[PDB]
Amino acid sequence: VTAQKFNGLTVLPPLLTDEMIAQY
Amino acid sequence: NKCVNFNFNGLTGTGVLTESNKKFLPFQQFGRDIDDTTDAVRDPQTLEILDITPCSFGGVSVITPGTNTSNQVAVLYQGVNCTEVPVANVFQTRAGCLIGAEHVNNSYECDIPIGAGICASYQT
Amino acid sequence: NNLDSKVGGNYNYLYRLFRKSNLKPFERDISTEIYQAGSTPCNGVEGFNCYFPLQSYGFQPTYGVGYQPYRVVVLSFELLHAPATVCGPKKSTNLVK
Amino acid sequence: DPLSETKCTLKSFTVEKGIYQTSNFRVQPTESIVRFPNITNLCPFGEVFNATRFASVYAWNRKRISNCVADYSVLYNSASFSTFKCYGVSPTKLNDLCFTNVYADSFVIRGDEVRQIAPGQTGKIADYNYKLPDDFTGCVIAWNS
Amino acid sequence: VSMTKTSVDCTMYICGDSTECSNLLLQYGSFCTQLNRALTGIAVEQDKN
Amino acid sequence: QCVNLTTRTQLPPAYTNSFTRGVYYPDKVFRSSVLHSTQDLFLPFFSNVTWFHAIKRFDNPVLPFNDGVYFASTEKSNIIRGWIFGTTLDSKTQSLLIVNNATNVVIKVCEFQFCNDPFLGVYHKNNKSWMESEFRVYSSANNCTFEYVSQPFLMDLEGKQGNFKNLREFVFKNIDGYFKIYSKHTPINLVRDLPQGFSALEPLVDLPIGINITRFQTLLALSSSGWTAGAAAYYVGYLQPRTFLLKYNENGTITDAVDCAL
Ligand SMILES: *[C@@H]1O[C@H](CO)[C@@H](O[C@@H]2O[C@H](CO)[C@@H](O)[C@H](O)[C@H]2NC(C)=O)[C@H](O)[C@H]1NC(C)=O
Ligand SMILES: *[C@@H]1O[C@H](CO)[C@@H](O[C@@H]2O[C@H](CO)[C@@H](O)[C@H](O)[C@H]2NC(C)=O)[C@H](O)[C@H]1NC(C)=O
Ligand SMILES: *[C@@H]1O[C@H](CO)[C@@H](O)[C@H](O)[C@H]1NC(C)=O
Ligand SMILES: *[C@@H]1O[C@H](CO)[C@@H](O)[C@H](O)[C@H]1NC(C)=O
Ligand SMILES: *[C@@H]1O[C@H](CO)[C@@H](O)[C@H](O)[C@H]1NC(C)=O
Ligand SMILES: *[C@@H]1O[C@H](CO)[C@@H](O)[C@H](O)[C@H]1NC(C)=O
Ligand SMILES: *[C@@H]1O[C@H](CO)[C@@H](O)[C@H](O)[C@H]1NC(C)=O
């Protein structure tokens, strides 16, 4: 597989980190 | 490093200014994003290449217990690093800044989901 | 024209040619003072590039149409937010339930 | 309070446990900043006013202005210029205005006959050696000498 | 399993920095709330997913 | 001065493929590490560009200038020197003049009266030095509107290298009363045709000219009739309204472009 923007769309982070899903 | 209305050679925009790591060709006076947004400018006096960052903003989230249970609440500044929030207990997370929350270490069971492994609860 | 004209010019009529800015909607500025159009202040009743903003209309019968004076009334009101205070030329009906 | 602001978002007097998004906080921008490549070809105004000798009125000089920035910065701003009018734009507003194409004029006349340079006016200056057009929306200036 | 969370400052996106626009938006109405109440539903549904 | 010299050998016009030469940086604006697309006026890729010489022979006919142009010269000793642009060419409208004399470049916009057989003329003797002799370009310019000139140099006409040593090139365009000049220079070892491969011209200068343009001429270096003028080649191609896609790289400089309907 491969922080605001001027107009106010936002990518927003996940509830579980990429470590916690690995721990599941 | 202040949130301002800038203008260079008539080119208006909103943000904070900073000295770039990027490098222009000799004759260009504006620079942009992959989304065609002025992400950069070159001050027509000093010529030093300035990157533009749009000021940090978002929905204030609020964390509350039941109205039945309390009148206390914690106020969450999503996406914003807290270093400009007092311009409007405190802690910082990948998901934003929790203000009015006692940052504990003990990893209890979850209740009020926030982000990047964080969630809140009401306890003594 | 047939009232507001005077053959020597009816200079009873004054306007405000200048002000620090445009006034507020439905506002009315009674300020007489000398308007400081230039960078200089002016102290006393006169000076360089400070000008009397109150300036005058001439009106006469020898002037052309639309250069002539016109009499104006501007009716303003608000509507049905609240109890009535004037009502139109219709009689109230019977009432039915 | 945020407590009243959530009660307000929900249009409710009760609220249970939760996280509620509200109030889009945004930095009200603190001031403006402005930048230009500093003015260097200023328009050549010294020779239009400060020049040692002007022409006769029948020979009234006319020269072209272009390629420059046209400051009134010592022009209108010195009171010794004993008359001026730009007829369409206020005398305050010409530093913010622009020109497509320009010619400037230089000559001497009598103080009594200064009123005769108005467009659509008479007297031997006006009718025989300097006349102006009916639309005239360039600008005009005069000073005692 | 899930798609990225998003939200938008619909007011900043429709007319950034403009009060004259903002008074035009205040004739449109609930569209700004609605266009994040939808995205909240997505955002929570990623967590539930 | 003007003298109408007719003294040359008679030849038809030549033609050749444009390859991927004829793009410019479309707007004055930086990007880096992107694939970005533009719609504007451009030289189509793989056009039959017209091809011209100086030699015995001196190709300098009247060319139309519809929507502006690409011009490129494979060169030795600076034979191609100036440019002349307009629509009446006889003082009934304005026109533009741009040349590089023996000591300064000069750029002017006026109601011009250009020559019927123009060139720039030079003393040619064997005494190891070549200098200005004559300047056959135009007589009148009685209204003028622009006034630009270089700092003083010496720019030669002496040399005897074989194949073409340097490639110089330009885009000329006339939009909203401005002129736009784009250029590039690169050394070459090429004998009789344009370089394959790719580059994009930089905006060299912009000028407030204000003239509707329909035709163009070029100025080249040279008891009047009968003459020697040196060996040179140059190529001419039009601009169509077309999309292009570009690679702008890590350095923010141009890497490649694609003609969209090729
Ligand atoms: C803006 O104005 C300044 C002069 O006031 C020009 O820059 C000067 O250049 C020398 C070069 O060695 C510097 O040492 C000075 O410190 C500069 N002065 C200032 C005040 O910065 C500059 O060239 C002008 N800008 C442009 C685009 O020409
Ligand atoms: C200039 O070139 C042309 C030949 O093509 C000649 O000029 C002509 O001169 C007459 C007036 O005597 C005009 O009616 C023609 O219209 C002109 N033609 C052009 C195209 O200019 C003339 O032979 C040449 N002049 C000299 C001095 O050699
Ligand atoms: C909530 O609090 C009120 C007291 O303010 C109480 O009367 C009510 O019964 C409580 N409701 C529940 C469901 O606990
Ligand atoms: C909480 O944990 C951090 C390390 O994750 C440690 O530095 C800090 O002292 C601890 N604080 C308390 C109050 O336990
Ligand atoms: C003309 O020069 C004198 C100084 O010799 C100065 O007082 C005056 O302000 C100047 N005006 C302009 C327009 O240059
Ligand atoms: C001989 O050389 C000089 C330069 O040293 C040159 O000016 C002159 O024109 C040459 N002689 C002739 C007859 O042209
Ligand atoms: C791009 O930047 C690198 C690293 O600084 C440099 O070595 C390289 O020469 C540049 N590319 C070109 C085409 O000059």
* Backbone dihedral angles phi then psi of residue D125, each to the nearest 5 degrees: -60, -55
Rounded to whole angstroms, the Cα distance separating C84 from C92 reads 14
Name which of B43, B55, B71 is nearest D35 (Cβ-Cβ). Answer: B43
What is the 3-state secondary structure of chain F?
Answer: CCCCCCCCCCCCCEEEECCEEEEECCCCEECCCEEEEEEEEECCCCCEEEEEEECCCECCCCEECCCCEEEEEEECCCCEEEEEEECCCECCCCEEEEEECCCCEEEEEEEEEEEEEEEEEEECCCCCCCEEEEEEEEEEEEEEEEEEECCCCCCCCCCCCCCEEEEEEEEEEEECCEEEEEEEEEEEEECCCCCCCEEEEEEEEEECCCCCCCEEEEEEECCCCCCCCCCEEEEEEECEEEEEEEEECCCCCEEEEEECCC
Q: How far is B68 from chain D (nearest CA, A)?
A: 8
| C42 close to C50: Cβ distance less than 8 angstroms | yes
The beta-carbon contacts of E23-32 under 8 Å, at least 24 apart in sequence, are none
Nearest CA to ligand 6 atom 14: F125
Burial label for B69, CB within 10 Å (0-12, 13-18, 19+), is exposed
F148, closest residue in chain D (CA to CA): D67
**C22–chain D Cβ distance below 8 A for any pair:** no
- Give the pair of three-digit tokens for residue F153: 């140099």
Q: Are strands F63-64 and D140-142 parallel, antiparallel or unpaired?
A: unpaired
| C47 close to C4: Cβ distance less than 8 angstroms | no
Residue by residue, DSSP assigns C73-94 as: -------SSS--SS--S-----
Residues in chain D closer than 8 A to C41 (CB atoms): none
Give break positions in chain C: residue before each, C–N beyond 2.5 Å.
Answer: none
Q: Are strands F20-24 and F198-207 parallel, antiparallel or unpaired?
A: parallel
Comparing CA positions, the residue from C6, C17, C19, C15 lying closest to residue C63 is C6
Rounded to whole angstroms, the Cα distance separating F81 from F230 reads 13
Q: Which residue has the tokens 């046209």?
A: D70
C17, closest residue in chain D (CA to CA): D90
Q: Does ligand 2 have an atom closer than 6 angstroms to the CB of F4? A: yes
**B29–chain F Cβ distance below 8 A for any pair:** yes
Neighbours of D85 (CB within 10 A): 11
Q: Find the length of chain A.
A: 24
Rounded to whole angstroms, the Cα distance separating B19 from B48 reads 7
- Give the pair of three-digit tokens for residue F97: 């003049």
| F232 close to F221: Cβ distance less than 8 angstroms | no
Instruction: Determine which of E5, E7, E10 to mutate to test the interface with B (most B C-beta atoms within 10 Å).
Output: E7
- Tell me the residue type at C70: Y
- Give the pair of three-digit tokens for residue C43: 């102290």
- B105 CA → ligand 4 middle, Å: 6
Are E7 and D29 within 8 A, CB to CB? no
Q: Residues with Cβ < 8 Å from B113, sequence gap 6 or more?
A: A15, B119, D19, E47
Are F252 and B30 within 8 A, CB to CB? no
Beta strands in chain C (DSSP E): 14-16, 54-56
Among A residues 1-24, those touching chain B with beta carbons less than 8 Å apart: 3-6, 8, 10, 12-17, 19-20
**C54–chain D Cβ distance below 8 A for any pair:** no
- D49 CA → ligand 5 middle, Å: 8
**D98–chain B Cβ distance below 8 A for any pair:** no
Q: Does ligand 5 have an atom closer than 6 angstroms to the CB of D145? A: no
**F158–chain D Cβ distance below 8 A for any pair:** no
Name which of B5, B45, B113 is nearest D19 (Cβ-Cβ). Answer: B113
D18, closest residue in chain E (CA to CA): E44
Comparing CA positions, the residue from D144, D66, D59 lying closest to residue D104 is D66
Subunits in contact with chain E (3 or more CB pairs closer than 8 Å): A, B, D
- What resolution in angstroms does the PDB record give? 4.3
Burial label for B24, CB within 10 Å (0-12, 13-18, 19+), is buried
Structural domain boundaries of chain F? 14-262
| D6 close to B62: Cβ distance less than 8 angstroms | yes
**Homologous superfamily of the F14-262 domain (CATH):** Spike glycoprotein, N-terminal domain (2.60.120.960)
Are E8 and A9 within 8 A, CB to CB? yes
Q: Are strands D32-35 and B4-8 parallel, antiparallel or unpaired?
A: parallel
The CA distances from residue F40 to B92, F43, F183, in Å, are 49, 10, 18
How far, in whole angstroms, is CA C45 from its chain's centroid?
25
Comparing CA positions, the residue from F36, F64, F38, F37 lying closest to residue F50 is F64
**D67–chain F Cβ distance below 8 A for any pair:** yes
Are B24 and F28 within 8 A, CB to CB? no
| D43 close to D74: Cβ distance less than 8 angstroms | no
The CA distances from residue F220 to E13, F77, F82, in Å, are 57, 11, 7
* Backbone dihedral angles phi then psi of residue D32, each to the nearest 5 degrees: -90, 155
Rounded to whole angstroms, the Cα distance separating D69 from F261 reads 45
Q: Does ligand 6 have an atom closer than 6 angstroms to the CB of F128? A: no
First to last CA, chain F: 47
User: Measured at the alpha carbon of residue C21, what is the angle toward residues C15 and C25, in degrees to the nearest 5?
Assistant: 75
Query: At what angle are helices E31-48 and E19-28 packed, to 10 degrees?
Result: 80
Q: Residues with Cβ < 8 Å from F242, sequence gap 6 or more?
A: F39, F40, F41, F42, F44, F259, F260, F261
Rounded to whole angstroms, the Cα distance separating B11 from F238 reads 33
Q: Are strands D61-65 and D102-106 parallel, antiparallel or unpaired?
A: antiparallel
Exposure b/e, D10-20, CB count within 10 A at least 16 = b: eeeeebebbbb
- B104 CA → ligand 4 middle, Å: 8
Contact residues of ligand 1, CB 6 A cut-off = B 44-45; D 37-38
Element of type H or E holding D1: none
Beta strands in chain E (DSSP E): 5-8
Rounded to whole angstroms, the Cα distance separating F98 from B90 reads 68
The CA distances from residue B95 to A14, B77, B81, F139, in Å, are 8, 9, 10, 75
Neighbours of E31 (CB within 10 A): 10
Rounded to whole angstroms, the Cα distance separating D135 from E16 reads 42
**B58–chain E Cβ distance below 8 A for any pair:** yes
Q: Residues with Cβ < 8 Å from F71, sequence gap 6 or more?
A: F169, F170, F171, F172, F218, F234, F235, F236
Edge-first strand listing for the sheet containing F131-149: F63-64, F215-220, F80-86, F95-100, F105-123, F131-149
* Backbone dihedral angles phi then psi of residue B112, each to the nearest 5 degrees: -110, 90
- Give the pair of three-digit tokens for residue B121: 């609860």
| F105 close to F78: Cβ distance less than 8 angstroms | no
First to last CA, chain E: 6
| C53 close to C18: Cβ distance less than 8 angstroms | yes
- Tell me the residue type at D104: A
**B44–chain E Cβ distance below 8 A for any pair:** no
Ligand 6 nearest-atom number relative to CA F123? 9
Give break positions in chain F: residue before each, C–N beyond 2.5 Å.
Answer: 55, 222
Q: What is the dihedral of CA E4, E10, E15, E21, to 10 degrees?
A: 170
Rounded to whole angstroms, the Cα distance separating F102 from F158 reads 12
How many CA atoms, within 13 angstroms, populate the side-chain half-sphere of residue F90?
3
Ligand 7 nearest-atom number relative to CA F250? 1
- Tell me the residue type at F226: G
Are B45 and D23 within 8 A, CB to CB? no
